[PDB]
Design a protein around this ligand. Structure first.
Ligand SMILES: CC[C@@H](C)[C@H]1C(=O)N([C@@H](C)c2cccc3ccccc23)C[C@@H]2N(C(=O)NCCCC(F)(F)F)CCC(=O)N12
Ligand SMILES: CC[C@@H](C)[C@H]1C(=O)N([C@@H](C)c2cccc3ccccc23)C[C@@H]2N(C(=O)NCCCC(F)(F)F)CCC(=O)N12
Ligand SMILES: CC[C@@H](C)[C@H]1C(=O)N([C@@H](C)c2cccc3ccccc23)C[C@@H]2N(C(=O)NCCCC(F)(F)F)CCC(=O)N12
Ligand SMILES: CC[C@@H](C)[C@H]1C(=O)N([C@@H](C)c2cccc3ccccc23)C[C@@H]2N(C(=O)NCCCC(F)(F)F)CCC(=O)N12
Ligand SMILES: CC[C@@H](C)[C@H]1C(=O)N([C@@H](C)c2cccc3ccccc23)C[C@@H]2N(C(=O)NCCCC(F)(F)F)CCC(=O)N12
Ligand SMILES: CC[C@@H](C)[C@H]1C(=O)N([C@@H](C)c2cccc3ccccc23)C[C@@H]2N(C(=O)NCCCC(F)(F)F)CCC(=O)N12
Ligand SMILES: CC[C@@H](C)[C@H]1C(=O)N([C@@H](C)c2cccc3ccccc23)C[C@@H]2N(C(=O)NCCCC(F)(F)F)CCC(=O)N12
Ligand SMILES: CC[C@@H](C)[C@H]1C(=O)N([C@@H](C)c2cccc3ccccc23)C[C@@H]2N(C(=O)NCCCC(F)(F)F)CCC(=O)N12
Ligand SMILES: CC[C@@H](C)[C@H]1C(=O)N([C@@H](C)c2cccc3ccccc23)C[C@@H]2N(C(=O)NCCCC(F)(F)F)CCC(=O)N12
Lengths: 180, 186, 186, 191, 184, 180, 180, 185, 179
């Protein structure tokens, strides 16, 4: 990671740019949540810029970021550069309305949540109910953010569904493709 | 490891027992074990469709579908299949113990019987987990319904008593209706 | 592990069943299992080209090409091959269950039948992935077409019903046309 | 991985990692599995913050799957011991000892964001060896469960019998259900 | 394992022909199934002649041990027991299970008694169930040992709290065996 | 393996040889031995070679191939299940007019696979060897199918799956045995 | 490992030189994207110099870099030193027209994208369609940047195709070979 | 992982050390003992009269490492107050009991566990004998010191440490391992 | 193993081969062979070949006690090596009928073992292995004519003896010199 006279990521944070550039786990969420809180305290009115190049990851970690975005006063603009898959694409769609972007060759992928369960029948049932409720929660929020029905979201996320930047715009996941 | 007996014919000990209509279920129940036991049951029915068969059970259980292969074959054939628990019958083992001919399900006094709900796993997409969950729940309903019919206990009581590992003495298994008699030594 | 029976002649239990025209498909289907079953079918046809053969199926499935070795050999030989599901017939196992002679496909009441689409893999260059994808899609079409002919269901319905794991009871398998009869115990 | 922030003050600029910057404003992040190291760090932060100012509130962020019960109790007892109120917020997930610590915040100052997940269940453990050693371990984990349930009862207003029943297996609650249960006081809805 | 020819037998099968069963390993389900089968075979061959159970075993599974124990008590023939080498844990329990008056050891054989071993992991209630089960199992073992030795349950409990090694002569004094066979 | 003889030995008594696995040296040695045994038993009666094989070693395959051509009896071939790579080469090696498949059998043809590491000159030697091996295979396949070497080269460039009927049209087999 | 003068890479960044000297993954892309953004903010008119010595890597990570290059105002000059393979050679070709270079002994390699898929037939189909669309996207852009037809790019990338610096120039991947 | 505070820039543990608080928050091995011994020596040199505060959240560990800490506590002039937060087991509970008389504490939900020392030996009979004698002497040494610090007899300590013995904070006080449970205000 | 297999052929002539590490399986087999041979003929000598690095003490005692229990004399011969429990069993043969070939190696040393866990568990294990060593040394004293104190000293560490030194020690009666 190069230094500027700051490491490069810290330099970007000084200009209110947060980089979500990896798999989403609890550590990544904690860092992004902290950066959002720091930026709101520095200036509660200026926009924040969230860069997303992520294959997704933990749903609860993703919701930590999602809820923090909605909680703070500044608008959080989102941009997909490279790829936004799974919880990554969910967070892309979570940006301030009118301020969700992708570059033209960026890839957006949506699909249903993944998980596991082992043990007794009743334990498997509890895990199944939990992941099904989690999917309903995700689909409901995605419906509100895209303007698509819950039934359409359900159908379109049944398997891996790859979208171009332009298709993501048509879907309502982003507002604009930034053409060079 | 397995001794031979000579009667002129040479038999390993298990084959010698099979000649007297005794089948040994002495391991974890998987497809191989089920196939072997199913084959022995079919062989014995063909040898004599009227004489009792004796199924020895010392098993920690195992695959439910493999257990049902044995269960359905027991019910399908004409001979009565007597069951005895020696050592332990747990899970599908205890289900098979309860599957023996009415009046002919036994245990020795220090045998251990354990009943519990089925175990499994699932990973992948939400809808795949749902399918696996529905399947294991239906399997549990099927097991509980049959156990209710075989023991005389209600489905609601079976559900409650199999929620966690439930260890029974031979005498408790008799009181429960899983077996008919404890063979006390003379 | 596998007991012996003595009639002058000494047989393992499976060989004894084969003498009465019973073939046991009791494991995952791979090339070895297919070769053995194909050999048994050819042997039985040569022993008697008119008497029925009995194919026991307790299998989670396995290789599609191995399954087709068995399927084609069943159709090629003169004797009718009766099929019975005891325990489980999943994937290629359920395909082979459905391949038995019309009117002579059975299951015991607690047997489980599962149908789903074929599984596979591919890695390498885009064009290699394309070739592998085309191959598995053609394989699925071939399976679905044959299943349609054997069950009486449309190809479109088979496609829909095999999209994910679909578990059927013995009675549901009969209603579907995978088997002809559930053998209820007497 | 962890960004730096630089604040220019009148006696030279200061460089903080982001978590240290939050600690300066009395925010402690419990963002991982709870083990002894995590507990020691959080205990130290609580003691430091009390010494800096014994009257100002502390803010404990909880995004945790839980972990060691004794480590969790190190944090719990330190929270109750110090003078400042410790506000708690669930962001993401609070499971097991995480949800216990969420419920341990100052009364009226326990929060969650709307899509946060709270999970409660009974403690997990292990025991091997002789029969009498297994008995000792069993008695210990059963007493530990009674201790947890009693405290949870006091903090939520639910009876011990209800806590026992509701923690028998994994029990997932929405933020709103956690409020109704008494684990938190308020769901912070976005403005 | 050598062969002997009269018909060809492996050495263990040859001993089984003279009603000698060898329990010469750790006790698991396979060993128990084999020994149970041999006992049933021998009873069917002759319901009146004594059976001879050789024990050189570090013990093993309690339920497997009880399969053997209950089969011994169930059959009509007397089962004589001898400790050669070592009988530990369930091995020593089976040694004590032989027909009264017909439990032996050779002079340098080692007998060890101790409480049962086990494990449990998972939820508190699962640990409780496992603990209750192993405690009941210990009570069952101690009660039977009390009946077979003539020692009180309280003394058995105390003496099995930790590993307790006995010489053949001490095992006789304890009531685990009836006689030490001294060489002529 | 059931007894009647083990089942495979019983089939060998009726001049049926089972090639039902990956082709390695052990399999080739066994099949070569069976062919020599059968020729000695009767030099005029047909032999029946069952093929359900994913292929394997080229030199092992050539041991079988050359032994088939060397002996006096006609060797009939049948594909049941799958004949891939050297398996399909051996299928095509059966006596002209006596190469069969069952209707759902799969035939796959492709170029040989291999490996080489070390110095540049060692890599060159290995490359020349595998290229010569491919030429040898293609030339023989051309003679057995009636297809040109140029067409064989093109059609084996990547994995090429054929149905039994397509294998007949290609000239790899003579007839599909339809069930009566 | 990395000498100080600033560490050496940060010193080069001060003069608007970015080093892409490794396999392209998300971390590398995020770092390069950040450097490009930083440099544009420092001076939106001065050229940027992108050094490429890379075996390639992730396609989506490569597209993060590609789209950021096209998005920013400064011209990004590219030079191949050592090797540019796969996505590395794609990025080499993405430099400002007239300002794509290689040193004389640099190696350029082009080939089709690599990937994988396992699971159900329909999942394999989705993965196959995705990688085929990705290849079309890459080939279309390469056609625009080189002046070669899509059909020629398809043919020339079917297998590993190694080019000298001079051949890369003739192909249109670079504009000039810098002779010493 | 470990946050920084600015007054000078300190990691949080160093900041606590400036106020005479030492954290024993892990398994006790030689490294941990060396660090704690060094902190104790540093603090005595800074001020030989002011109390030191030793936080204990530890499952125990090496007996000799524990004795390095124990002997250093007794050697230095300042009183070392001890507090159990979370758990003090085995050598951890021994060190808890080693604090200055009247200044050994626990928080109400802290767990104290006492048991006999653990170890191992393999090799020749005479090597096993040497290892057995050593661990038995070590147990006698531990029990004698625990007797002096708690007021319990050696015979009672022996009996109560035969197996794992878990105590609540209040039970630890009754036992004499600590002097007071700090109840929250 | 060449073909009776060769070992079974030797057993027909009352020769038992102890040619490996002594564990429970080996002991069970040798005990069974001894019982079989006594039943075949209670008066004829048995010949026990010993080429063994030793092994389990309790397994060795299974063999030892069975030798002493049966009526036939058991002659012992060391060919190759008899170490540890192997040398103990060599010394256990019938008095006057314990042999070695001239280049055979005999090694004596104290028993080996292990203990882990609580102090009291280590104490129990230590007491047990010390009592086992006393039992071994007492029997070796009776069989060799050496004092217990001398056996203790000489087994403190690995002590290698030639066949002739083993004879002088009293572990064997005779070295069979080739004719
Ligand atoms: C400024 C109002 C809302 C935003 C409020 C709030 O909702 N939180 C949340 C995000 C929060 C975070 C962590 C722990 C919490 C515990 C209880 C309640 C809220 C908590 C903390 C937040 N606080 C700050 O953000 N302070 C400035 C810190 C700046 C920097 F990030 F450190 F640089 C503490 C004062 C407070 O009332 N809030
Ligand atoms: C002769 C009374 C008792 C000994 C009685 C009995 O309790 N069992 C038990 C041990 C038993 C074993 C295995 C499965 C059983 C199933 C149900 C009931 C008893 C079973 C089986 C036993 N049987 C035999 O022992 N038959 C001869 C066996 C010969 C040989 F071992 F094969 F060589 C079957 C007839 C029967 O009534 N019993
Ligand atoms: C005697 C009526 C029922 C019992 C009937 C039957 O249900 N099955 C079942 C168990 C069966 C087994 C295996 C494959 C099958 C395939 C299709 C239908 C039933 C099958 C086979 C069974 N058959 C035999 O058991 N024959 C004798 C074999 C003796 C020995 F086991 F080999 F020793 C074939 C004649 C038949 O009509 N049945
Ligand atoms: C009886 C007519 C058809 C059935 C014909 C046939 O289609 N095949 C097939 C199944 C076949 C099997 C294996 C290799 C083959 C190779 C080429 C052609 C057919 C083959 C072999 C089959 N043959 C036999 O099955 N003979 C009896 C062997 C019985 C036993 F299995 F050994 F017990 C060889 C004589 C033959 O003309 N056929
Ligand atoms: C029968 C004429 C040709 C076929 C001739 C021949 O080409 N070979 C070949 C196949 C061969 C095989 C193995 C080693 C060889 C060594 C040198 C030359 C040929 C060899 C051996 C073959 N021979 C036999 O096949 N003998 C009978 C064996 C029958 C059975 F297989 F054992 F059942 C030895 C006599 C011989 O001249 N030939
Ligand atoms: C200057 C107009 C375009 C270039 C515009 C833009 O398109 N992006 C992109 C590259 C962008 C990056 C990261 C996150 C984003 C989130 C939403 C929209 C765009 C984002 C961010 C970019 N911004 C900056 O580049 N600010 C200066 C940062 C300098 C330094 F790198 F920190 F040194 C934020 C203000 C803005 O409107 N843009
Ligand atoms: C301020 C009153 C209570 C809170 C009191 C106390 O109970 N503890 C506890 C938490 C404590 C911590 C660590 C070891 C202990 C050992 C024995 C007793 C208490 C201990 C330590 C606490 N002390 C401090 O907190 N000093 C200031 C340290 C500030 C900073 F954290 F370093 F930044 C030591 C003086 C004292 O009497 N206490
Ligand atoms: C002041 C009397 C006692 C405390 C005396 C002593 O007993 N030790 C002990 C603890 C000691 C420690 C390390 C190595 C030793 C080697 C030999 C003897 C004592 C040693 C060292 C101790 N010394 C210091 O503590 N010096 C100040 C160091 C302060 C700081 F820790 F660096 F911050 C050296 C002068 C000395 O006589 N002692
Ligand atoms: C002269 C009697 C002494 C030798 C006596 C005896 O001490 N044992 C011992 C070795 C023994 C072995 C195994 C189990 C025993 C159980 C209880 C008592 C002695 C047992 C068994 C021994 N027996 C035999 O050795 N019979 C012949 C067996 C021949 C062959 F080994 F099978 F080839 C059983 C009859 C008996 O009374 N004894």
């Amino acid at each position: 990671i190069p230094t500027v006279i700051y490491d490069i990521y810290s330099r970007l944070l000084k200009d209110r740019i947060i980089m979500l550039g990896s798999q989403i786990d609890d550590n990544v969420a904690n860092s992004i949540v902290s950066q959002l809180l720091f930026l709101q305290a520095q200036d509660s009115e200026k926009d924040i810029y969230l860069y997303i190049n992520s294959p997704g990851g933990s749903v609860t970690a993703g919701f930590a970021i999602y809820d923090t975005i909605q909680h703070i006063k500044p608008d959080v603009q989102t941009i997909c550069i490279g790829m936004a898959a799974s919880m990554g694409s969910f967070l892309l769609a979570a940006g301030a309305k009118g301020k969700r972007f992708a570059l033209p060759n960026a890839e957006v992928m949506i699909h249903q949540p993944l998980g596991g369960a082992q043990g007794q029948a009743t334990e498997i049932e509890i895990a199944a109910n939990h992941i099904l409720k989690t999917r309903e929660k995700l689909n409901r929020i995605l419906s509100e953010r895209t303007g698509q029905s819950i039934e359409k979201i359900q159908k379109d996320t049944d398997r891996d569904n790859f979208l171009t930047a332009e298709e993501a715009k048509e879907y309502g996941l982003i507002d604009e493709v930034m053409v060079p």
